């Protein structure tokens, strides 16, 4: 269990605070935590929100316990680093890290583009140096180019959404970030497409891989019921409105009707959101074209579950750990089956315990996805 990992009294007390949601480590968490505590550079594909972040952090906390504070001198960079592909995912990771580090001595910080660089490069942010830092690649690259941060001081690196970090837009900035090569590297994801894994082999030397659940196409969660849309797109939104009418029943019983809508395009998301807000639906939309402060407020509201209907662009498909996720509608089916499965795993992120509803609309480009639906 968790006690097999040798958790510190702060770590054990925080794990006890995580009860009844944590009474023992998950089997994937059991496979991941002490091997990371063995310091081995590895990559783990598992269920999203399955405590894998906690499994990575506990071994990271143990490794940081073995690290001296003398490397924490002013002006240098952190030794414990984490990467996220979205500012929302990085913010959620920083919020999770700040709870565990309240009873610990690790300083937790977040870095992303589109925010106040004065606060990012602040004297108690950049110069005083922290133990735990989750950073977007753009802000980190800007800091390194402007010498606001360093890369020789790192000792433990974590790559959250590493498959998403392996994006063609995201690979170059990561390689630019790639720097002491002897640091312990751990990557976390939901699944590993093969063409990116060998890319990891570009910078790998005898690593390890930890896979969870079925080794095949693990498309269907046993706790998630799925349906196929046998209707054209033209009334499908109306059918979604009918589903909203069905969600009206979900609005009636108090069983939580937090609905997350998958939209492929930010402008299409805006048009659909204008239609839904016209349709008297309490909808909030988050996208890559949204304002950064507006996106931050919407993310805080969704964390508080303030908007029972929320639309999300390609910026917000995967990695979500949202409490009370009971309604998930792929208003646009994801262009990748991996993306569709990741959006599916974003809901019901409390684990195998919290249930939810999943409905996906079907369009003509997604016709070939019907074989993917098989």
């Amino acid at each position: 269990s968790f006690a097999d990992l040798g958790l510190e009294p702060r770590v054990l007390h925080a794990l006890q605070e995580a009860a009844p949601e944590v009474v023992q480590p998950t089997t994937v968490q059991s496979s991941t935590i002490p091997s990371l505590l063995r310091g081995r550079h590895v990559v783990c594909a598992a269920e999203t929100g399955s405590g894998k972040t906690l499994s990575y952090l506990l071994p990271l906390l143990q490794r940081l316990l073995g690290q001296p504070s003398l490397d924490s001198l002013p002006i240098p960079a952190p030794r414990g680093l984490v990467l996220v592909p979205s500012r929302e995912l990085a913010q959620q990771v920083r919020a999770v890290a700040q709870p565990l580090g309240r009873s610990l001595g690790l300083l937790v910080r977040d870095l992303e583009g589109g925010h106040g660089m004065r606060r990012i490069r602040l004297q108690l942010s950049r110069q005083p140096s922290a133990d735990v830092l989750v950073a977007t690649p753009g802000a980190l690259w800007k800091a390194l180019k402007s010498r606001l941060i360093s890369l020789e001081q790192l000792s433990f690196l974590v790559l959250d959404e590493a498959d998403t970090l392996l994006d063609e837009s995201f690979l170059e900035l990561v390689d630019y970030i790639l720097f002491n090569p002897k640091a312990q590297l751990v990557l976390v994801g939901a699944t590993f497409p093969e063409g990116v894994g060998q890319l990891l082999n570009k910078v790998a030397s005898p690593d390890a891989v930890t896979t969870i659940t079925s080794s095949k196409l693990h498309c269907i969660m046993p706790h998630v019921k799925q349906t196929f849309l046998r209707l054209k797109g033209a009334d499908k939104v109306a059918e979604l409105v009918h589903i909203l009418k069905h969600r009206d029943r979900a609005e009636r019983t108090g069983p939580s009707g937090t609905v997350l809508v998958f939209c492929n395009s930010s402008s299409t998301v805006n048009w659909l959101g204008y239609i839904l807000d016209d349709h008297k639906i309490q909808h909030l939309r988050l996208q890559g074209q949204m304002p950064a402060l507006m996106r931050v407020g919407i993310f805080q509201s969704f964390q508080k579950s303030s908007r029972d209907i929320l639309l999300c662009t390609d910026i917000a498909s995967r990695g979500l750990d949202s409490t009370g996720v009971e309604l998930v509608v792929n208003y646009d089916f994801p262009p990748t089956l991996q993306d569709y499965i990741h959006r599916a795993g974003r809901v019901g992120r409390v684990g195998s315990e919290v249930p939810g509803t999943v409905i996906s609309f079907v369009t003509h480009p997604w016709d070939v996805s019907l074989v993917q639906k098989i």
Binding site: G39, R40, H41, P68, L70, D207, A208
Partner: protein, 325 residues
């Protein structure tokens, strides 16, 4: 996976609970001394060396130091003369053997001539090359003398009373390597009189080839308990002079140990060519000291983005032309 250190990791024990209680390298010389102490160790994570590499006398010295301090006082310090002649004489008397062994190891004389087995020379021997009348050129361990000044046989001094002096060039000139060219052979020398002993090989001048770098010629005297027979008369033959000192020391110098050595450098000069023409009766060879040539890159079909120098690498030179006149 994760490779940690095989041996003890650096900076592991000195951490402790109280890091601020450490003494810390306040002086940069202290950190340098600690680093040098660590570097003296061979370690377990490999390195560049892995791939490349009496009481009465003390009381008398204390009294002498006290007398020197009293004579100085302080006032002489505030710039002592300290003549180097008496210091050098006392160093040759007291601690000359370790420095002599170090110099012999540095020159590779024991490793080449004696095939190893370096020894500290007890007898301090210095040579005096006759250059006119006054003065005589002093030859210590490593003192360089040109072949022009070394035409005649030099004198030697060791301040000792049998002995056997020999001279060998460890450079292996003319013939094959791992050999030394003998130049002189004095044997059964009674007392300090080197002329008392017989002369088997008469003294020949140095003959270093042109452009062959520097040559190493060493003159050695060994402590002889009993006189022994030898064997080659005054000859200019190079085959008779070719002999290794290790073989002579092994199976012939059984009751004999080394006493003193003096090393010298030898280079090509006018007297070397004169000895080659007249005495050796042969043409003097000249060496080139040539470095390896460029590898030259791989030739492709098109020069790509490179400048005009791509198509002109792997032949020669300056005026060649087209099909045919």
């Amino acid at each position: 996976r994760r490779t940690p250190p095989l041996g003890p990791m650096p900076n592991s024990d000195i951490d402790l609970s109280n890091l601020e209680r450490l003494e810390k390298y306040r002086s940069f010389d202290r950190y340098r001394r600690r680093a040098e102490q660590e570097a003296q160790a061979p370690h377990w994570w490999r390195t560049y060396r892995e791939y490349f590499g009496r009481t009465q006398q003390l009381l008398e010295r204390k009294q002498a130091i006290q007398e020197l301090r009293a004579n100085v006082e302080e006032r002489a310090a505030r710039t002592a003369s300290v003549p180097l002649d008496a210091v050098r004489a006392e160093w040759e008397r007291t601690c000359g053997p370790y420095h002599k062994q170090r110099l012999a190891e540095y020159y590779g004389l024991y490793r080449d001539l004696f095939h190893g087995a370096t020894f500290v020379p007890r007898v301090p021997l210095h040579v005096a090359y006759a250059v006119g009348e006054d003065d005589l050129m002093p030859v210590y361990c490593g003192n360089e003398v040109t072949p022009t000044e070394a035409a005649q046989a030099p004198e030697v001094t060791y301040e000792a009373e049998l002995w056997t002096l020999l001279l060998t060039s460890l450079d292996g000139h003319l013939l094959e390597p791992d050999a030394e060219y003998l130049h002189w052979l004095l044997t059964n020398i009674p007392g300090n009189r080197v002329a008392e002993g017989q002369v088997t090989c008469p003294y020949l001048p140095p003959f270093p080839a042109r452009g062959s770098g520097i040559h190493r010629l060493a003159f050695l005297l060994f402590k002889q308990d009993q006189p022994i027979d030898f064997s080659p008369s005054p000859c200019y033959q190079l085959a008779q002079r070719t002999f290794r000192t290790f073989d002579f020391y092994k199976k012939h110098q059984e009751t004999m140990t080394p006493a003193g050595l003096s090393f010298f450098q030898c280079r090509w000069d006018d007297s070397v060519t004169y000895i080659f023409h007249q005495l050796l009766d042969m043409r003097e060879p000249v060496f080139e000291f040539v470095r390896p040539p460029p590898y030259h890159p791989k030739q492709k079909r098109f020069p790509h983005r490179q400048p005009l120098r791509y198509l002109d690498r792997y032949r020669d030179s300056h005026e060649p032309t087209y099909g045919i006149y």
